[PDB]
C-alpha cells in the first residue's frame, strides 16, 4: 500500500547505497533519474537544504542523506533480516565504520581522481591505508554484517564500482595491495541485490572522464 | 551497577555534547581529562583508529564519535525522556539536522577563526546562513526536540560556548543577525544540564587564542 520513490543519479555511490538497501529489504519503489544540471521541482521540494540525491520519498515524506536513508529503511521495513545490529554497542560500531566510508573512502577516492602529482600519491596511500583498516575490521567474517549484508556493507560496497576509475586515473592496483578487500567485494557481487545495485565500472570510469574534461583536469 | 567513563578534553564542543547527553539522561559516570599531546594508554586502547575524544567506555566497551555516542546513550538508558523521536521519519529529520551541525556549524566556525580576509568573510556569511536555516527548522518550538532537549539540541547548543570566540576573532555579532538562535541558546541555558555541560565562553576564547599563537595565525 506504501508509496516509495527514489530520486537518484545513476553513477552516484550514495544513490547505489539506497538502491542496495531497498533491494536487500525487498522494498518495491519507483526509481526517478534526476538531471542535476536542471533539478526537478520534486527534488527541490524534497531536499531544499542540500538539493542533492539520493532522496527517498515514502508516503509523501522525504528522507535525505544516504546513510540516514539506509537507517530509515531498516527501521521501517522489518520483514527481512536487519541491516543494523540490535545490540547498542554493535550498532555504534556499525555506525562508526559506515561513517568511516564517507569520511575516508569517499573523500580520499575523490582526491585520487581530482588531484595530481605528490598530492595524488598521498591520497592513494591514505586510501589504501583506509581500506586496510576496514580489512582489519572485517576480520575473518564473510561480510561486515557477519553472515548477511549489513549497514557497513551497504555503506562500502557501492564504492567498488568506482575502484576501476580510481585505479586507472591514479595508476595503482587495489587487489595487489588489498587482496582481502577485493575478495570481499567479489563475494558480495555474487548476490543479486549487490550486482543489480552496483553500476558497471567501465561506465563509471567514462563518467569520471567526462567530469575531468569538464573541469579541465585530464 | 554499570561502569561508565568519559574520555574528554574540556573545551571540545564534541565532548560537551556527550557531557550534556549523560546529564540529560541522568547517567552517573567518571570524567577523565585527556592530554591530547601525550595520549593515554586508555585513549589509544579505546579509539585506535581516530585517537580522538570524546570516547565513552561503558562496561569496558568503547563508543567513539560524539553523535554516535549520544545515540548510544539514548538507546541504552531509558528511564528518562528520549533524545531521538520514536517515529522513523522524525528520527531521520533529527539525524539530518544533527549532522548539519557537524558539516556546517563546526566546519564554518572553524574557518572563521583559522582564516583571514575574504575567505574569513565568506565563512562568516555561510555560518550565519547556516544558523538561519536552523532557525527555520526550529520554527516556533522552544527546542529542536520540541518541548524537551533532544538530539539536535545536544548536537548544536554546545557550540554556543564557542560563539564569543567566533564573534571576537571574526568580528561579527550573532545576536544581531540571528536573534532567534540566540534566544534559543539562552533558553537552553536556563536548564541545569545545559549550563553545567557548557564551558565558559571567555575560557574557550582564551583556548582558541592559545591555538592561534601556536599556529602563528594571530
Ligand atoms: N552526503 C550525501 C552526498 C550526496 C551527494 O553527494 N550527492 C550528489 C550526487 S553523487 C548530488 O546530488 N549532487 C548535487 C549537485 O551536484 O548539485 C549523501 O550521502 O547522500
Ligand atoms: N568527529 C569527532 C570529532 C572529535 C574531535 O575533533 N576531537 C578532537 C578534540 S575536539 C580530538 O580529540 N583531537 C585529537 C587530536 O587533536 O589529536 C566527534 O564528533 O567526536
Q: d(Cα A128, Cα A134) in Å, to the nearest integer?
A: 10
Experimental approach taken: X-ray
Cα–Cα distance list, B135 to A39, A48, B95, B142 (Å): 25, 15, 16, 11
Neighbours of A26 (CB within 10 A): 10
Choose which residue among A10, A12, A52, A56 to substitute to test ligand 1 binding: the one with the highest number of ligand atoms within 8 A of its C-beta.
A52
Q: What is the DSSP string of A153-181?
A: HHHHGGGHHHHHHHHHHHT--HHHH-HHH
Structural gaps in chain B: residues followed by a C–N separation over 2.5 Å: none
Phi/psi at A11 (nearest 5 deg)? -85, 0
What are the structural domains, with CATH classification, of chain A? Answer: 1-86 (3.40.30.10), 87-218 (1.20.1050.10)
Helices (H), chain B: 13-24, 41-46, 66-76, 88-100, 107-114, 117-138, 151-156, 160-170, 174-177, 179-188, 192-197, 201-215
- Residue B8 has phi, psi (to 5 degrees) of -155, 175
The shortest CB-CB distance from B61 to any of A69, A71, A89 is to A89
**B83-99 as b/e: b if 16+ CB within 10 A:** bbbeebbebbbbbbbbb
Long-range contacts of B88-92 (CB under 8 A, 24+ apart): B88/A72, B88/A75, B88/A76, B89/A58, B89/A61, B89/A63, B89/A72, B91/A72, B91/A75, B92/A63, B92/A64, B92/A68, B92/A69, B92/A71, B92/A72
The Cα A194–Cα A196 span in angstroms is 6
Q: Please give the Cα distance from A94 to A152 (Å, whole number).
A: 6
Interface of A with B (CB under 8 A): 49, 58, 61, 63-65, 68-69, 71-72, 75-76, 88-89, 91-92, 95-96, 99-100, 133
User: In sequence order, which residues have a C-beta less than 8 Å from that of residue B199 and are 6 or more positions away?
Assistant: B10, B11, B16, B161
Owner of C-alpha cell 577485493: A182
CB B5 within 8 A of CB B30: yes
H/E stretch holding A215 reads helix A201-215
Q: Which residues line ligand 2 (CB under 6 A)?
A: B 9, 12, 14, 36, 52-54, 65-66
Residue among A76, A96, A133 minimizing CB distance to B65: A96
The set of protein residues with a Cβ atom below 6 angstroms from ligand 1 is A 9, 12, 14, 36, 52-54, 65-66
End-to-end CA distance of chain B: 49
Beta-carbon contacts of residue B206 (< 8 Å; ≥ 6 apart) = none
Chain A to chain B Cβ contacts (< 8 Å): 52
What DSSP designation does B47 have?
Answer: -
Counting ligands in written order, the one closest to the CA of A55 is: 1
Q: B52: CA distance to ligand 2 center in Å?
A: 5
What ranges in A25-87 are assigned the alpha helix state H? 41-46, 66-76
Length of chain B: 218
Distance from the alpha carbon of residue A163 to the mean position of ligand 2, in angstroms: 30
A136 class by beta-carbon count within 10 Å (0-12 exposed, 13-18 middle, 19+ buried): exposed
Contacts of A184 (CB under 8 A, 6+ apart): A135, A138, A142, A143
Answer yes or no: is B66 a known binding residue: yes
Helix or strand run (H / E) with residue A8? strand A4-8
Rounded to an integer, what distance in angstroms lies between the CA atom of residue B6 and that of residue B210? 25
Q: Edge-to-edge, what's the strand order for the sheet holding A4-8? A: A30-33, A4-8, A55-58, A61-64
List of long-range contacts for A84-93, beta carbons under 8 Å, 24+ apart: A84/A150, A84/A151, A85/A150, A88/B72, A88/B75, A88/B76, A89/B58, A89/B61, A89/B63, A89/B72, A91/B72, A91/B75, A92/B63, A92/B64, A92/B68, A92/B69, A92/B71, A92/B72
Residue of A nearest to B63 (CA): A92
Q: How far is CA B120 from CA B41, B110, B127, B202, B213, in A?
A: 38, 10, 10, 21, 18
* B149: phi then psi, degrees, rounded to nearest 5: -65, 120
Grid coordinates given for A218:
585530464
**A75, exposed or middle or buried, with CB in 10 Å at 0-12, 13-18, 19+?**
middle
Rounding to the nearest 10 degrees, give the CA dihedral for residues B15, B21, B27, B29.
Answer: 0
For residue B199, the Cα-to-chain-centroid distance in whole angstroms is 11
Measure Cα distances from A209 to A29, A199, B152, B187 in Å: 31, 16, 40, 52
Amino acid at each position: 500500500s506504501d508509496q516509495v520513490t527514489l530520486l537518484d543519479f545513476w553513477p552516484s555511490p550514495f544513490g547505489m547505497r539506497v538502491r542496495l538497501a531497498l533491494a536487500e529489504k525487498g522494498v518495491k519503489y519507483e526509481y526517478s533519474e534526476e538531471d542535476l544540471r536542471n533539478k526537478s521541482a520534486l527534488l527541490l521540494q524534497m531536499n531544499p537544504v542540500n538539493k542533492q540525491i539520493p532522496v527517498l520519498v515514502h508516503n509523501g515524506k522525504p528522507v535525505c542523506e544516504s546513510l540516514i536513508i539506509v537507517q530509515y529503511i531498516d527501521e521501517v521495513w522489518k520483514d527481512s533480516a536487519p541491516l543494523l545490529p540490535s545490540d547498542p554497542y554493535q550498532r555504534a560500531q556499525s555506525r562508526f565504520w559506515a561513517d568511516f566510508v564517507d569520511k575516508k573512502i569517499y573523500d580520499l577516492g575523490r582526491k585520487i581522481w581530482t588531484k595530481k602529482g605528490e598530492e595524488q600519491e598521498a591520497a592513494k596511500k591514505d586510501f589504501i591505508d583506509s581500506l586496510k583498516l576496514m580489512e582489519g575490521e572485517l576480520g575473518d567474517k564473510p561480510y561486515f554484517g557477519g553472515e548477511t549484508i549489513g549497514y557497513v556493507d551497504i555503506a562500502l560496497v557501492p564504492f567498488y564500482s568506482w575502484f576501476y576509475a580510481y585505479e586507472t586515473i591514479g595508476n595503482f592496483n587495489i587487489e595487489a595491495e588489498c587482496p582481502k578487500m577485493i575478495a570481499y567485494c567479489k563475494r558480495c557481487l555474487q548476490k543479486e541485490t549487490v550486482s543489480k545495485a552496483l553500476e558497471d565500472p567501465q561506465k563509471v570510469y567514462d563518467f569520471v572522464l567526462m567530469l575531468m574534461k569538464k573541469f579541465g583536469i585530464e
